[PDB]
């Protein structure tokens, strides 16, 4: 199980849309040569570090939604390979039948 891993993951998700995709302006914009070429850009580069170590979209492991498995993820369904198979055979994923071409 390791429920605590799921807790870590959901905390990272929430805190990450908490800060970023809202305050990306500290790097996406102020780094521009047209924004600064001097102490302003340096002050922004150092300000980007006091935001928590989380809150980056680059720290989500993107686990399964039912069992929380790290590996074998499928972005289309949000499930691991095991769960998409066990649910596809039961007939719950629409339109997903066995392919043979």
């Amino acid at each position: 199980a390791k429920q605590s891993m799921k807790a870590r993951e959901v905390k990272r998700v929430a805190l990450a849309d908490k800060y970023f995709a809202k305050r990306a302006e500290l790097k996406a914009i102020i780094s521009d040569v047209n924004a600064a070429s001097d102490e302003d850009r340096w002050n922004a580069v150092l300000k980007l570090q006091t935001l928590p170590r989380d809150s980056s979209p680059s720290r989500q492991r993107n686990r399964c939604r039912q069992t929380g498995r790290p590996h074998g993820f499928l972005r289309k369904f949000g499930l691991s390979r095991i769960k998409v198979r066990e649910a596809a055979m039961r007939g719950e994923i629409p339109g997903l039948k066995k392919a043979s071409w």
Partner: protein, 99 residues
């Protein structure tokens, strides 16, 4: 003007009858109906491991086919638009209208 209707579905019989329901209800208000045209179907494939552990060559291959139909209406009287916006089809069809 022209009004354009795009129909997407996961099976072809439901979307076939949905396109019917559209194109005769368009002729019911006496309108010219261009189509219906089958656009190419988009089939997305997936390949999964089927053991819980350590069995790399044992796999399953699934696919989802999306069927696409297009219909254009080129002589809309006012009783054609409402006459198309009142129509009841089962849940498998997604319609997108374009003015």
């Amino acid at each position: 003007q022209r009004i354009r209707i795009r129909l997407k579905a996961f099976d072809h019989r439901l979307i076939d009858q949905a396109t019917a329901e559209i194109v005769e209800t368009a002729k019911r208000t006496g309108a010219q109906v261009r189509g219906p045209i089958p656009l190419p179907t988009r089939k997305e494939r997936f390949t999964v491991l089927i053991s819980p552990h350590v069995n790399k060559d044992a796999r399953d291959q699934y696919e989802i086919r999306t069927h696409l139909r297009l219909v254009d209406i080129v002589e809309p009287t006012e009783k054609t638009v409402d006459a198309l916006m009142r129509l009841d089809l089962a849940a498998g069809v997604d319609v997108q209208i374009s003015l």
